[PDB]
């Protein structure tokens, strides 16, 4: 009933500490649909901060204590009531143990404590799954939440290419990026960049990319000058050059965006300046989605949705996320919308927001 | 949420008493799948017996008191937990008001009290649905239980032809016949044919066909001599010449078959002769399904299944009916069986039978 853990067979490809990376799998032999989900969980952008992460959030840097099984939730649930359209898919959860926003593509240097291999983890999972049924797939949906969402944007075209090169051109590779669409904006009030809470988005990725030896998609890399590849971690910059179809799910007021912007909305009264900052951030997010054909962007203050059990409950313009996703799937193959962006100005202006 | 009643616009096509026939409809604009379900409810084969039926089961002869709405159940449910694969289909329930096993194709004669138009009801429903979305369909599944099941066998190729003639050759017409697969066998002990309870199966249909002016499929009609069209109401005789794919669901020990065979199994001890009769009936039913590629035939004493809420619960050889149906749908488009026939000798030898 649960997804079962498999540790990768390729010993070169590891979590930060060198323990084997892996994936959880629940096979569904009556379906040709595969859902490959990339876990989120922030990042670390220097050795001091990765050392702290290792001490406090070891599961995000090591496979040593991963459980043998995981129950799928939300889009990974095999229960029809929880996942009405896609419950019968082949379900894969790839734990995030690379701290690199799934962008690392090099073996560890002798001058590093940690290895940053997230892009290679994805590649190796895909290769091992080919011997487990993925060879027969019709659709491979690379999905992800938060850092995993950004990971989808960074890896979907790599995966697409990989399957073609390996001899499986009929598998349709698509992406689903949830809560991974950020603005490289100015903080409301500044804090010096010392950790992931205090570091403005541009600065965090400029530092991170270098530390991780992170790679970005080739089609986006071209658009920016040498040393300016950090741009490609920002959805509105990377999205227009993608080859693969990607559906974008994004809360207009994402809690992680607010955190790195040094805004904390807790149900307190706010001053006009903060009001304006927050309203403008929602407008800016809307602006970036105007030409994204397949999107779901409710006016709520939240973070992540697709593996949450109550992902069926939020609606935009009268339509749920699972339905919008189904409509998109059909469009890629009347009364079935795929572009669903709220336009009201403040979080919870949509009555269906999670509470 | 419910299916809503529509009375047919074609005034020539009526229930037994001349009231308008009709259909219940729940549209699902995000699906190209249509389920058209034919209700069962025995038959009447002369005026005396139809008069009694009118007095005691008027709903089966008249639309006068039909409710404005009906909740879909089983395969007609829009609830994922109840109908895991096909909950999102366009749902149509066609009430049985013709008492003719859906075989009547003539206007009423002035020498009759009742009109027998069941084949024409189906045709007229299909024509009216074309203006309601069916024009866009990918799959039209003509399904039915008991008399409706036999109705599927009698009408599926007519429907197929009809859609082609009307200019919609891309719609894939298929059938699902539940509890409509009977043997034209000898009664265990004889009773004179005076009503539907006492009349042996051959005699019932020989009488009925004539009374109804019933029509049978052309491909089967050819196989039998003039006046021997009654043969075509028996699945094992009509099935081999069908053009359309038909999935057959049949309890090995169908309660209606036993009734017309003058057997009543109620959990009492039975004599060896009755034991042998019942065992042979199961063997015979098995024999008739050996070359039916898509079938689900559990060793249970029951009648009907596909619109029952607990249709998900019975299993044969480890597989449920909704799954077998999904596997068949995929086959028509490994680890996905479609031919599922029990081989044990007595009802309830399958532990999953309904209780
Ligand atoms: C092992 O992983 C590395 C990096 O992803 C890759 O280049 C190599 O092809 C893999 N080896 C095998 C045998 O799959
Ligand atoms: C009315 O129904 C009759 C019998 O089914 C049929 O022959 C005729 O074509 C129908 N008329 C219309 C206008 O659909
Ligand atoms: Cl299945
Ligand atoms: Cl390091
Ligand atoms: Cl839909
Ligand atoms: Cl009559
Ligand atoms: Na902050
Ligand atoms: Na709006
Ligand atoms: Na009887
Ligand atoms: Na068996």
Curated annotation (Swiss-Prot), chains A, B:
Keyword Signal among record annotations:
yes
Organs and tissues of expression: Rarely expressed in adult normal tissues.
Keyword terms of this UniProt record: Glycoprotein, Hydrolase, Phosphoprotein, Secreted, Serine esterase, Signal, Wnt signaling pathway
EC main class here is: hydrolase
GO terms (molecular function) for this protein are: palmitoleyl hydrolase activity; phospholipase C activity; protein-containing complex destabilizing activity
Q: Does the keyword NADP apply?
A: no
Q: Which GO terms describe its cellular component?
A: endoplasmic reticulum lumen; extracellular region
Catalytic residues, per the record, are: 146, 254, 303
Q: Which residues are glycosylated?
A: 10
Concerning what turns on (or off) its expression, the entry says:
Up-regulated in hepatocellular carcinoma (HCC) with high intracellular beta-catenin.
EC number assigned by the record? 3.1.1.98
- Please give the family membership noted in the entry: Belongs to the pectinacetylesterase family. Notum subfamily.
Supply the name of the protein. Answer: Palmitoleoyl-protein carboxylesterase NOTUM
Gene name tied to this protein: NOTUM
Note the residue range shown relative to the complete protein. 87 to 451 of 496
């Amino acid at each position: 009933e649960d997804l079962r853990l498999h540790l990768l067979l390729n010993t070169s490809v590891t979590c930060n500490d060198g323990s084997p990376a892996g994936y959880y799998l629940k096979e569904s032999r009556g379906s040709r649909r595969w859902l490959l989900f990339l876990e989120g969980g922030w990042y670390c952008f220097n050795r001091e901060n990765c050392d702290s992460r290792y001490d406090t959030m070891r599961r995000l840097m090591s496979s040593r204590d991963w459980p043998r099984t995981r129950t799928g939730t939300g889009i990974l649930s095999s229960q029809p009531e929880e996942n009405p359209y896609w419950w019968n898919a082949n379900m894969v959860f790839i734990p995030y143990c690379s701290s690199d926003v799934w962008s690392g593509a090099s073996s560890k240097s002798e001058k590093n404590e940690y290895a940053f291999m997230g892009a290679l983890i994805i590649q190796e999972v895909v290769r091992e799954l080919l011997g487990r049924g993925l060879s027969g797939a019709k659709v491979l949906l690379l999905a992800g939440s938060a850092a995993g969402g950004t990971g989808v944007l960074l890896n979907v075209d790599r995966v697409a290419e990989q399957l073609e090169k390996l001899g499986y051109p009929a598998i349709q590779v698509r992406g689903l990026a949830d809560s991974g669409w950020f603005l490289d904006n100015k903080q409301y009030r500044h804090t010096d960049c010392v950790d992931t809470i205090t570091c403005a988005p541009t600065e965090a990725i400029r530092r991170g990319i270098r530390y991780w030896n992170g790679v970005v998609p080739e089609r986006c890399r071209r658009q920016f000058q040498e040393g300016e590849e950090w741009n490609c971690f920002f959805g509105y910059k990377v999205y227009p050059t993608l080859r693969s179809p990607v559906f974008v799910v994004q809360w207009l007021f994402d809690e992680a965006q607010l955190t790195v912007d040094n805004v904390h909305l807790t149900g307190q009264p706010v001053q006009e300046g903060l009001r304006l900052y927050i309203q403008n951030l929602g407008r800016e997010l809307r602006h970036t989605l105007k030409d994204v054909p397949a999107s779901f962007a409710p006016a709520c203050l939240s973070h992540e949705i697709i593996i949450r059990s109550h992902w069926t409950d939020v609606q935009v313009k009268g339509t749920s996320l699972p339905r919008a996703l189904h409509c998109w799937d059909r469009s890629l193959h009347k009364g079935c919308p795929v572009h669903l962006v709220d336009s009201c100005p403040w979080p919870h202006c949509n009555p269906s927001c999670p509470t």
